[PDB]
Amino acid sequence: KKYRREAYHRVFVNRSLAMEKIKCFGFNMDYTLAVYKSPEYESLGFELTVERLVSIGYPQELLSFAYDSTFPTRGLVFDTLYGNLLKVDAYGNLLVCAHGFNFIRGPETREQYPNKFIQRDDTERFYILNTLFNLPETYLLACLVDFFTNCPRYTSCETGFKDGDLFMSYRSMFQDVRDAVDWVHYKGSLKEKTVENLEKYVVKDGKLPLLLSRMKEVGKVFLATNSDYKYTDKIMTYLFDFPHGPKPGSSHRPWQSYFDLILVDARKPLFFGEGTVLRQVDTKTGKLKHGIVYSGGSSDTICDLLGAKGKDILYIGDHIFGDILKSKKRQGWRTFLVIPELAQELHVWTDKSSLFEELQSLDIFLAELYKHLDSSSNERPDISSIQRRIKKVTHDMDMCYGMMGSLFRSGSRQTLFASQVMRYADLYAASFINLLYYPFSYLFRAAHVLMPHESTVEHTHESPLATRN
Amino acid sequence: KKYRREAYHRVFVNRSLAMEKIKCFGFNMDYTLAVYKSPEYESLGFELTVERLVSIGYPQELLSFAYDSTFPTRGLVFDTLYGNLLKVDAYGNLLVCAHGFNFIRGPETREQYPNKFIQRDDTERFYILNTLFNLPETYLLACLVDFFTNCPRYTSCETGFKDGDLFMSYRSMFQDVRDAVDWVHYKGSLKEKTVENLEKYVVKDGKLPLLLSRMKEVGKVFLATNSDYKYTDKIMTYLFDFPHGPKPGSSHRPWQSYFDLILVDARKPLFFGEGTVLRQVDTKTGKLKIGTHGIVYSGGSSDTICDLLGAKGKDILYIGDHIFGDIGWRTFLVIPELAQELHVWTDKSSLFEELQSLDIFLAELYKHLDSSSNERPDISSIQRRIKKVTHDMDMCYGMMGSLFRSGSRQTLFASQVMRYADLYAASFINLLYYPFSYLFRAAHVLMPHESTVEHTESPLATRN
Amino acid sequence: KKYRREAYHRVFVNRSLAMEKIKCFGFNMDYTLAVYKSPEYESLGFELTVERLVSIGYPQELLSFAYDSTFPTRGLVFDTLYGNLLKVDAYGNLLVCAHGFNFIRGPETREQYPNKFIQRDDTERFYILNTLFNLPETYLLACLVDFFTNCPRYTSCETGFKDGDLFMSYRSMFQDVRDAVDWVHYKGSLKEKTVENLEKYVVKDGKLPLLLSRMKEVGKVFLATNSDYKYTDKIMTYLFDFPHGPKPGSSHRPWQSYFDLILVDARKPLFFGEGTVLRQVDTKTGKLKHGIVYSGGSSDTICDLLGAKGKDILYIGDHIFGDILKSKKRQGWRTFLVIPELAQELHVWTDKSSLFEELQSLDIFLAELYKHLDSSSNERPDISSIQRRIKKVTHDMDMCYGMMGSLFRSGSRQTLFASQVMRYADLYAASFINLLYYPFSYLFRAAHVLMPHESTVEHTHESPLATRN
Amino acid sequence: KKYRREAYHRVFVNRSLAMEKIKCFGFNMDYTLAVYKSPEYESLGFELTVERLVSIGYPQELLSFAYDSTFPTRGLVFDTLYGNLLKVDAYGNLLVCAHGFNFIRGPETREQYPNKFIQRDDTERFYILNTLFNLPETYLLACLVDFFTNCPRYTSCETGFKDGDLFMSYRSMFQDVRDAVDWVHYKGSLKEKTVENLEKYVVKDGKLPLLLSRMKEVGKVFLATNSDYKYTDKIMTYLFDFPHGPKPGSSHRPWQSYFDLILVDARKPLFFGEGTVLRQVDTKTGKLKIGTHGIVYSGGSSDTICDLLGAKGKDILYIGDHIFGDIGWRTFLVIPELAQELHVWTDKSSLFEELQSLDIFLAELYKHLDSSSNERPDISSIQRRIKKVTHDMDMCYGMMGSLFRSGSRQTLFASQVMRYADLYAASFINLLYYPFSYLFRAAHVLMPHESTVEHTESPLATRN
Incomplete structure (x- = not known):
């Protein structure tokens, strides 16, 4: 209030x-x-990176790629071993796995990833795509994995592809992309093309x-x-x-x-x-x-x-x-x-309230079905429909952010990126310009992060196993 | 609802x-x-550890220690360099610092701790007292630091105490404590004394x-x-x-x-x-x-x-x-502490209510103010009452505050709970109240922009 | 006999x-x-690799490199962290360290290498250049490290060089070389140029x-x-x-x-x-x-x-x-x-017998100076000259093999490559053609590898601390 | 010279x-x-381990074991899967395989060991008995495998023995032995019995x-x-x-x-x-x-x-x-074994001489032969004498042969010695015979093409 x-x-x-x-x-x-204006600036970086890669020998079909802002989300992990983009939580649990544009389902995720889990500290295998400049690179890695996987000229292996006699590992391909992005930023024409048309590229x-x-x-x-x-x-x-x-x-x-x-x-x-x-x-x-x-x-x-x-x-x-x-x-x-993504994400939060509301009432209905049951009960109410609807409505919500979901979460789970925000940042917003709306005497007061036993227990006013007598 | x-x-x-x-x-x-019944069982482990330390040479005044359940909270970090008990958040930011029984203010914390921050990965220096068996040792570390600090026979130093010619570092004192606790559990009389009076020690x-x-x-x-x-x-x-x-x-x-x-x-x-x-x-x-x-x-x-x-x-x-x-x-x-923490949550509601009222009043005082405003409303009073009421709230849990939080911030232990546990409760016996067909559904941990924005523009923000 | x-x-x-x-x-x-004929085949691989690297953006001075057979020895370790070529023994002890063409001395080796030792199992940092095809690549890595270190256009860092705004790590440079060698062998003109002039390139x-x-x-x-x-x-x-x-x-x-x-x-x-x-x-x-x-x-x-x-x-x-x-x-x-190198190495063994002989007589002289001394003696005979001469004559011997020494040893120490030969190979020779000189009933009898207490103790015929009573 | x-x-x-x-x-x-005096000290450790195993349930026939210094050589590998003692080279190639006291021939070794090779890095399976304290345990492992193999109360299996309803794997038997040795050293009477008769046990x-x-x-x-x-x-x-x-x-x-x-x-x-x-x-x-x-x-x-x-x-x-x-x-x-190994080297010279003569004779029989030759001279006799005289040589060291080699090949232990040690001798007391100004100069380990070629062509070899 x-x-x-x-x-x-x-x-x-x-x-x-x-x-x-x-x-x-x-x-x-x-x-x-x-x-930088979106998607124009990302496309420019995409296009320059593809041209640099074609210039070092990559095939001509790369020129038919077109940057698509609806795919990448910031903070994905590229697994150079298997050529997958991974959305993981704060502790390395897998939330999303995409090989090229092929999104890998729960069970087959386990084949490659035991326990649906990665050691995110293994910086030799996993590269975290954390920055706004990384966005074109994220989409590019998926395009290339997708192109090579379905182009008949190439035979797909688990850790790469064969170009005739040449085996190209996904790791070697990743290093080509990483080098080419760096070249474009530091030696290529990115700054020159930005500066010669500032109106198109800069807010x-x-x-x-x-x-x-x-x-x-x-x-x-x-x-x-x-x-x-x-x-x-x-x-x-x-x-x-x-x-x-x-x-x-x-x-x-x-x-x-x-x-x-x-x-x-x-x-x-x-x-x-x-x-x-x-x-x-x-x-x-x-x-x-x-x-x-x-x-x-x-x-x-x-x-x-x-x-x-x-x-x-x-x-x-x-x-x-x-x-x-x-x-x-x-x-x-x-x-x-x-954090620029906050502008669109706040729009989903208010313009998709219908999805959030139904999820809540589905959880309310569930609680009602088990209201009168305890460990003595042998009733097993049918929840397979409810469960299917929750999975579908949660998938719709995720997709409102784009193909790789919200920057901050995936279903109930917070992302690695969200946990890094809460470690690193005292304050955060879509833009610093929002300081305009606060006086310079303002006391910014931290918003509480409730744990389950706090957010689900009212302040409104026993076995000794719990109380230790 | x-x-x-x-x-x-x-x-x-x-x-x-x-x-x-x-x-x-x-x-x-x-x-x-x-x-294990509390405080009885911790008190027993405390007494046996103190007696074991006396037997290897620690002074007789240790026998005057009495275990005090109101002091220790699980999950504290013992800094063996400076002899402090630290309560820290998920990232290593200091929330509480106690030297013996002396609780250290914010500024003096910075003297020893640059940025009010520790590298919790420094295993050689910092020991994390996460377990329920660790509670007696946590109180014991404070008692020892308190005793030697205030006993004229000893000269307090940054990293320990001088006993005439001898120097006892907090690191060495810590090792003595750690070995003594292990000895009591593995070679001493703890199991024997538990088993010979089960009614006093075990629920x-x-x-x-x-x-x-x-x-x-x-x-x-x-x-x-x-x-x-x-x-x-x-x-x-x-x-x-x-x-x-x-x-x-x-x-x-x-x-x-x-x-x-x-x-x-x-x-x-x-x-x-x-x-x-x-x-x-x-x-x-x-x-x-010999066979299997x-x-x-x-x-x-x-x-x-x-x-x-x-x-x-x-x-x-x-x-x-x-x-x-x-x-x-x-x-x-x-997590047995939950039983008392849930009581604080419901019996101390009026402290929570008042903190919310003070927060509501602050929002009202800045309601009509932006970056063009020159007003600096006097909030020093309100700030002081917030600090006092948050401290009263912390103290409802004991001298080292809640297991899960300090004032507003979550603890390192809370973040370990959220990582490790699918389910948690004061006791597993609470499973008795759920059918075995139950679907447990995660309670969301909201971020600031989620919990303070209802479900109901500059191109700098929208990127055009 | x-x-x-x-x-x-x-x-x-x-x-x-x-x-x-x-x-x-x-x-x-x-x-x-x-x-394959030497040095012609290596030069061809060198030249094609340089051209492929220039084709992907490396500077034009690479075209003034010329393959030099007197530099590389097989089995060197390229440290991608510091851009050094390392000759190590069976257990990872450093024997030789070269940054570019600059050979690093005993004391300054320790700055970068604690205990003059590398973890040779760390395949992310260390690449072992074991094969005959690797020879041009070994020389190329030294040329590039040498070129960038002394070209004023580049600022040398400990782990790479700065090309204007671009930092190029030695590891990224190494991967460019490795990729370019692979390209040349599998997609480039190496086989075509070999086949069109077999007389020049194949024995x-x-x-x-x-x-x-x-x-x-x-x-x-x-x-x-x-x-x-x-x-x-x-x-x-x-x-x-x-x-x-x-x-x-x-x-x-x-x-x-x-x-x-x-x-x-x-x-x-x-x-x-x-x-x-x-x-x-x-x-x-x-x-x-x-x-x-x-x-x-x-x-x-x-x-x-x-x-x-x-x-x-x-x-x-x-x-x-x-x-x-x-x-x-x-x-x-x-x-x-x-093992083709055996042909030239056997020539050093016989044509440089003078060097071996002097080393022996220097060791004989040393034994004479200490003949009458034990732990009771306080005489400390001057051996600084003898020591200097042994170091110089051992360096001459090493250099008879080339700038990186013998394939098999460095001074008294056996190389990692030598220990791999003795693990892997039942028999070995400069060429399999030497089987021509043996009947197919031959019993090949292993040559003993004596340990110090065997090679220095005659069969020719006490404290209980030694005998355990 | x-x-x-x-x-x-x-x-x-x-x-x-x-x-x-x-x-x-x-x-x-x-x-x-x-x-420690040998065999007295190993014999004592043997006896105390056997008594400790009997006290935890091993059969009484263990008391009839007597330590035998002529069996074990240091550095053997115990394979807990098949219950074998293995002598291996630097790379894991099998040189010797003993099941109990039964020494296994080349072909039957291949049945259990593909390529006569073990993965010595498989720490869960293979235990390397490198230390001098390990000698009694090495002999004990063989005695146990011998006893249970030949005792009618037990059914021999690939991976252990059946005791009626019970199965005792070599892995579990090994663990019992390993714990028993640790117990004797750390909790049992080994130190006490050593110290009360120093003259019998310590040089x-x-x-x-x-x-x-x-x-x-x-x-x-x-x-x-x-x-x-x-x-x-x-x-x-x-x-x-x-x-x-x-x-x-x-x-x-x-x-x-x-x-x-x-x-x-x-x-x-x-x-x-x-x-x-x-x-x-x-x-x-x-x-x-308490202080330092x-x-x-x-x-x-x-x-x-x-x-x-x-x-x-x-x-x-x-x-x-x-x-x-x-x-x-x-x-x-x-390396105390060196004292006896140096005696074999000088007192058993005549075996060495004869092996060299047989090798010289073989070179003479093939002197005038190349790949065009059709002669297959009869060498089966010579081969048999080489095998017999090399076995006599091995046996001069004990039943498991030299610490440093087996027939012609170097042992894993020898290769560890060459890696780890700058200097080595039967005892450090040999330093008494060198001045403290001494320059110790490495003895070269020659490769075949070095030791068989004096210091005194096809382009396939020279690469033109």
Whole structure:
């Protein structure tokens, strides 16, 4: 019955955060300030990766692939041994298995996966596709596995395919894809084609300069991106290209004026440990040597330049980092995780309420059938129909998110990705722009995660085996 | 509003389980079938460990310790470097830090713990006290740290105490405690003193034979215990010592008649991997037969048990009190603390209500405020009352708070429960209230954006 | 004082073998019957691999590499973590470490390698370059590591190099090489360029038809090659292209007539386990359906077609196979290991006797300096000069084999490759043709491997701590 | 012809070692410093194990067993599936197979062993009896298999014996033997009976204090034993019990004065990894002090020893009787069998000579023969004499042959020696005959093409 802001404006709270204590707002650029348009940006990365793979010898049918945003979900595991995409829970239990576009059923999942379980720490065999840049790669791996499996020129093996005399393991194929994505991002034409048509590929919104200017009135604001200065300058200039400043009627000002500290070539995640040598960019040439642009460095250096403490820093961005080093080197930043998928997922939550409602009433009906039964009862009520309907309606709900289900769950089970969100992120939202709807004095209060004995037991007011006498 | 059984009869569901698919019910003995009375049994283990430590050289003031059930909560981490008991969350963030009986404030925690965080994988430094047998040792560690800290004969250091020329690190003190507890269980008088006063130390309840007999009508039932046969026979004979069988009026039956397979000397968790040689016990002498109904096994493996029972993993519901790692039986986890924690949940409702009211008031004070707002409403009072009422709530569980949470955050132990257990309850005896055709359906653990958004725009968010 | 055949004719005996019991002589083709000319064949494989790598984006300086037979030795370990070539002993102790062409000294070896030791079973990090086809690949890995390390366009890291924005790990580079060698052998122009100039690339000798015909008079003879029929037919026709048959004056006969059983597409090593489906080749088209050519199959099938027992079979070839399956499925063949390097190594053994002799007399001099000393003595004779001379003369000897030393040893220590020879091979020689110099009744008697307490104690005729009373 | 010390004083060299670089000499105690008398000590361990097995139910005819030193050779593999003792080479090829006391011929070996080969990595099936303590158990396994095979009360099966209703697998019989040996060493009377008649069971020799005192003049000396302090004190006091010190005329000194560091309760091999907490012993009570020259340590790690000694790995020569795996100290391996094996090598020379003559004659009979030859000379006689004389040679070592070889092939144990040991000898006491400036230079292990080709063509071989 408490007041809550409209859902699509909310910032969600994993751990409590008193915003009045925040003195510095730090930002990633890609997919945080620079939100890339979907599906256009993924298709561009898809198309460039396919072209690079064809350029190194992959067959011409790759050019008939077309990126399909309805297939990939972030956080899938590619098993390089069997060429499968796996959606797993926090502990490695298998929730979904797809070989190419063929979704593997419960029983035959066991043939390849004993106990429907993988050792997700075996980074030699399993690659976790966690990032927004990974999305085209996820769809591509399925396309290739699908193409080779059904093309007669190839004989399918359990761990790969035979191209004439050549055996190509799925692991070797995966490394070709991984290398080709990297090439496209770092040597290929991806940045050039993005920059030459910013309107098609990058979101633009006047709420961004407005929010960042309000942040700079209460604290310091900094940028730490892995991109180089040239690419950063093009992107940020575009993001702030309006015929006014923070508010309508005010003069436009340069994007740089919004930041107390600008840092490019960050080399994250190494940035958060030792980092690299702190350099400084010549703004004119964009080559190396307020108003200063830094290069490389470390999070510790940034902390000292801004005269701040880790807990005073709210770091806003799209990447999930690991717990490494946080038990030794002090000063850990607070974190805001941008999760774009939340916008569509919140729509499913409200626009598909019919599915959720029926699942609830099916569970209510079940409880009624067993209301009067205990271990003394030999009645075995028929629930096979109810069970079938629950499986079907749960499958419909999953499919409302796409072919690989919700980012956060699969049926009743939370995903590995969801558990990483709850580890990593103090706050999270579809976009950082939702901070616009909260004052900078706000106390963000953590939402409780109830366990079964809490969510199903009212506060409303015995065998000694339970009580230990 | 869906029908649910009375709270104290409930079996709670982490993952869905169709009971009609279960063909074998397996049991641990200790703290599952044989529920040890509390605080009596911990007090006995405490006293025997303290006496064992005195006999190897610890000072006489240990004899003045008395076990105090209100202090320890299961699942605490003992840091052998700094001598602290730590309550931590699923990821290693510190929730509580006690040096002896001194509870440490947030800021001073950071002095020893950068980022209020520990690497729980550092097995050489941190020992996790997860088991019910661990409760006396948990209290004992605090008493010792308290005693030596405040005794003039000793000089407190960061990593231990100086006894003149001698230095006793918390790591060495810990090893003494750990060996002493092992000795009491394996060589000392704990089993003997338990067995010679069963009424004081072990719960007895006629529901147990009743439930086990009903399980045997629908499938197979087995025992797999680490205890030896002599101890097991004594305990099980007591648990089944009634002047009738499963129901009043029926003849009493020996405990062995309730099990299709009885295995002692299991050596769990090794049991769940390679195991050891499958042996058989001479029930008359309690010793192993040289060669291999009526039969008692010893050693073996979980694989061998499945072959003898004609079962597959998913067909087996393994009922017990220990959490195992996952390096495939269904699992029922017995968690006896739940009985008192469910009472706090229903008898201390008014604390919960007030926290919700304070939260509702906070939302009201920021209702009309956004990033353009300059108001900073005074919330210091409200913040102070929230902190005080959350601490009152924690203290309702004991000095180290709830097994499953600290203030708002879930514990490492809670996250282990959610990983390991398909089903859980204060006792397996709650299965008596469910038919064997029951479909247990998982209770969802909601994420913030699910539990705070009803089922009833900037392109930065929608990606256009 | 016993009679021995001339060294370059010898067959060397690891385990005794009564040749009168052998009923079947089996053969590999590549580098056994078809001995490829050196260094020409390696250079061709080198050149094709470099061209394939340049074709997938590697820089143009690769075209200025030239294969150098004096660098690689067979059996080196490529450490994909640090980009080093490692020569190790039977147990993983490091004997030689080269980063590119930079040979790493004793002390700095320890920085990267604790205890001068590697876990050689870690097949994810360490790749063993065991085969004759591997030789060009071994030299290529050193060239590339050398090129990138000293080319200014690249920044060297510990685990790879930076090409602008792109980081290329040595492991990713290794996989590019491994893939490119495979492509060249199985899809590229290697076989075509070999077949179009057989005189330049394949050894030809009339002793081969003569020996195989004498083998067929006492037993059965079979061929089991991984090559396909078309390539096999071209190669074998060339090997038997003389204007006479086994002896001068006799009519020429087709290569096939020398074999009771011919098997192509063997898919070794899988051949020695379950194998593949036994197929039969249409000789005319060379496509699939005495005088019969088989395809695929298994060693067990071959054993049954020839009506033989494993111990009755002497399998002659150039590859070393593992112990897998030999504790379960019975019928293990006897083995003759062709080791071409033996021809040059036997030359060093006799033509460098001067180096061996001085090492011996330096060891004799050492023994004299300590002749009259025991634990009661405090004299510490100066041996620093002797020690320096032993290190230098041992280095000279090693270099007589090439930059990476002998195939079989490094100083006093036997190599991993030598220990695999002594595990795998009953007999071994520079070529199987040395069987020509032995009758088929010969008893091959194993040469003893003396331990130190045997080789340094004469048979020529005490504290109870030693005798246990 | 180079100068070499007398054979029975030699220290043999697997890898070169500059003794002047050695700064610390570390010692095992059992079977290194304390050499147990043979056959007396094995006979005692045998008798105590047999009595322990009888007490748990094994038949009375075990009491008629007598230990026989001429049967067992160290390093044999017990196959718990088929109940065989196997002597194998470095790669798992079978050299010898004994079922009980029945030695199995080549062909019948293939029935049970495809390719005359075992997977020595199959730890669940094969147990390798590598240690000197293992000798009594090796003979005991054969006696038991012999007894049950030939006793009418039992039915021999492939994998064990039937005792009416009972089946005793070799695997279970093996486990009984293994536990019985452990019990005798750790709970039974073996240590007590050793210590109460030291003269019968332990070698004593004045060279030991002499050598150790010379080592301490050039570097540090330490003891690291798995035995406890009470046992160690008794044994070491005996080893140093002479009415003088290192040399005649000098005052006797306590054994502890010979060591810069004394460590008991080492728990090797765990010692070489993480180890346990470094503790200190109260030399008066023999118990651990609660806190931590004159000092005796307990537990700890190899890393901790190196810090206390100010040493690095390569600076340490570790002298002892056990072979450890390599999952960096220099090593001296004590191998007491060498004393008798060196006697066979020099007193049985005439067998060696004759084998060489038969080999020389064979080479003469094939001298003028090549692949064109049709002669098949009769070698069946010569072959038979070779086989007979090689068997006579093997038998000079005992029924299971040499520790290091079988006929012509090297043993698995020999290949472990070459891997693990930089230096080796019958006893470390042979170090007395070498100055501490000595440079030990490896003796080469030659391959066939090296040892049969003096230092004094087809393009198929030369590759053109």
